Amino acid sequence: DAVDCSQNPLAELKCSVKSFEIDKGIYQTSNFRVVPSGDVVRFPNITNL
Amino acid sequence: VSMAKTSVDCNMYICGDSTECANLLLQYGSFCTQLNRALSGIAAEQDRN
Numbered sequence: 001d002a003v004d005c006s007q008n009p010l011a012e013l014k015c016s017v018k019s020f021e022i023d024k025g026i027y028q029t030s031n032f033r034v035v036p037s038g039d040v041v042r043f044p045n046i047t048n049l
Numbered sequence: 050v051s052m053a054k055t056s057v058d059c060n061m062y063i064c065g066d067s068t069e070c071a072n073l074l075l076q077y078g079s080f081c082t083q084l085n086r087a088l089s090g091i092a093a094e095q096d097r098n
């Protein structure tokens with residue numbers, strides 16, 4: 001048998017606890033974050049020329 | 050009969066958005082995982098208490 005650890009939330013837990021069978025309950029399997037979008041770059045107005 | 054149910058994001062703490070750091074953290078194995086279990090265990094007791 002085999003588990004694709006990226007398929008779904010269930011897969012993550014199974015891989016995380018290293019088991020093909022889970023008894024019951026609530027489990028934290030990973031952290032998460034939101035990915036930033038575009039870039040914002042800012043430089044000074046007037047310089048010497 | 051209780052204390053704060055604290056939690057720590059290991060990766061966030063060690064590696065402030067650094068890919069190189071993360072690679073240099075993974076080389077240490079289950080370090081983050083072990084810490085997570087310990088903190089979770091405490092919070093669980095805080096509920097029972």
